[PDB]
Structures are given as structure tokens and as C-alpha cells.
Amino acid sequence: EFLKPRLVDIEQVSSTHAKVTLEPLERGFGHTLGNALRRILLSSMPGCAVTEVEIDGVLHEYSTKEGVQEDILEILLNLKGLAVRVQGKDEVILTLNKSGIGPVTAADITHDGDVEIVKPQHVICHLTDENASISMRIKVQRGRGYVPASTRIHSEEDERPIGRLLVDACYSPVERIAYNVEAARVEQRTDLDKLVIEMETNGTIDPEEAIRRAATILAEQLEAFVDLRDV
Template sequence: GAAVTSIKIDGVLHEFDTVPGVREDVMQIILNVKGLAVKSYVEDEKIIELDVQGPAEVTAGDILTDSDVEIVNSDHYLFTIAEGASFKASMTVATNRGYVAAEGNKKDDAPVGTLAVDSIYTPVKKVNYQVEPARVGSNDGFDKLTIEIMTNGTIIPEDALGLSARVLIEHLNLFTDLTEVAK
């Protein structure tokens, strides 16, 4: 999946700062940015921009992206800006798996004021499964597996299931390699 790894807000040096004319503090803005459902069509890091003037309720749809990055939840609320105020920020988007803490996203060569963000790359939000007895013809010795997958919209559930099966197979291949070594 893809996620924001860092944000640089003009005039902000640390996450405990505030932006004049913006209702939310920087910490709350970062929390809201973490809720973006981002889809990246390239493996490289990409920069997306946000440049708004007040008054406005700023949503993910206000973020400027190119053809390599798509914000799926464009109605996701980010912050409210007052009349006469302006807000400019750039965010780095990367692709990866799982979760990376902000500490893991810090870069030594990043410009002053660049704030690393916790990145949740997994597009899967929830998975449920249920096993029930099933009958095929007169034989009732079968089981039926029902899998329910909910995602953030950046991947369809069928693709998420296929990808997760492929990852599981890759991990289990380590055990088959051990069997070959034992022979």
C-alpha cells in the first residue's frame, strides 16, 4: 500500500506548533493526514502539495497530486482555515507493507521543519471469516469458507485476498526449503 511518510508545513518547525488562522494544531493536522487513503502507481517516493486560502474546510480533495498518486477518500476532513489565512504544505508519499513508526520515516537530510509521520500502509481495514458445514449432492462432509474483507478503497477485496495469499505462500516456501535441506 501507500501512505504519507512526512509533511513539511510552511512556518512550522515542530509538531507542537500551530498555524495562524487554522483551527486545528499541527498534531491534529498530522493525525488527519494519517487518515488519507492514498494509492500510488509507482514504487518511487512522490511529493504531493496542499496550498489553500481561507475561509475553507480543507479536505483531501484539495491536495494537488499528479497522475502517479491518487487520493481515494477525497472527502476526508483535514482542517478548517479562517478568512485571510493561508496554508501551504508538501507531503511525501511512499509505498511499503504494514506499519512504519515516524522514527523509521525520519531522514537525516530532510529540510528543517520536515515532520515524520507514522505510516499505515495496509489498505485492509478488517477481515472476518466463517466456516460452515456444506453439502455437495448427498455428501455433507464438506466445509464452506466465507471471507469478508473491508478495505480503504485503494484496493478491491479480491485483489487484497490474492496478494495476501501470494505473501503467505512466499513465507511458507521457507519451510519447504528446509525440507529440501534435510534430505
């Protein structure tokens, strides 16, 4: 004779902003679950992000192209923010090719099946010359957490092509997490609480899958606890 919380309505206000509700929470477990989920979400949500980039006419991050106004380094900085959803493969090669005057946005990426470009309006560059043309190949991987270039440099593994441009990998889609435990008047009970998780992401991980995976991870660690050897 106990209760247990069931996942209820998940309102989506915007593509990035989401509210998830959990109705039948026992007194006291509101904050426990709120915080556990906040921690797991902020720390461990797997996402995909660009790991390295190859642009044609550029030797290193610090050089500059004709007919663009951003520096190449700023192009990498723009790519770091690219929110992308990869479904099947672990490493995909996206291709960006644009010519002529105009802003090179994220929408211009060559449309592949398995990859979803969440924010096509995201700017990359501005051309400023009729005959100026930019071509690049952006390599996107799946991962968890935060891995900088400089740590992976120990494991270079034939980084030999000087055209290669390494980018720091922020393998995490979630930007912000807040939760509120508030009185959940259930028709036959006095003091019950509902947990409301409000989350802001770059628009790659869907709310339901994020929450499910986080609960999965926490449940797995609890599983680790259930058995105790004492041997």
C-alpha cells in the same frame, strides 16, 4: 483424486467493506485457510501512506498557524488517516494549496495521475480568515507494516531541514478481518464448506489483490518447506 478450493464471487457492499467467497473447501481446511489469510492480511498487506510533511509557515509539529483552529499536530494526525493509492512510483509528492474561508478537505490535493485519493471528503483543516492561506507538500511512500518516527530517527540521514515533519507510517490498508466457514452443499457431496472472508479496509487495496498476495506469501513459505536439506 482430491478437491481444491477455487476463488468465487467477490461481493463489494461499499468502497471499504468487502466479502470474498471460496466455495469448494475440504472439511477441516476452512478454519486453516481462514486463519492463515486473516493473519497474512492483517500483518503483511503492502500499502502507501504519508511519511513526512512540509508546511510553509510552520517550524515544528507543535506550532500553530494563523487562521486555522486545529493545531499543526492535529493536521499530522489527520494526514495519518489519508487513504491513498499509488501505482507506479515509491515516493510521490502531493501538493495541497487552499485559500479563503472553508474546510480544507482531501479533495483539494493537486490531482496527479498515478495517485488516487480514495476519500476526497476527508477533512484536513478549517480556515477561518479571508486572507488566510495554507500550502503544504505531503510525501507518500509504499511500505509494509508499521514504522514509527522514533525508530527511523536512528537513520536520520540528514533530517537537517527543520521544516520537515515526520509522521508515523502505518503501511497497512486493512482495518478488520473476519471469516466464517459454513456448510457448502455441493450437489454431489455430503459435508463440504465454503469460506467467507469479510474485510474492512481504508479503501486502497482491492479485495482480489489482497487475497491473491496473501495466498502468494503463504504459498511462498510452503515452497520454502517443500525442500529439506538434511545435509
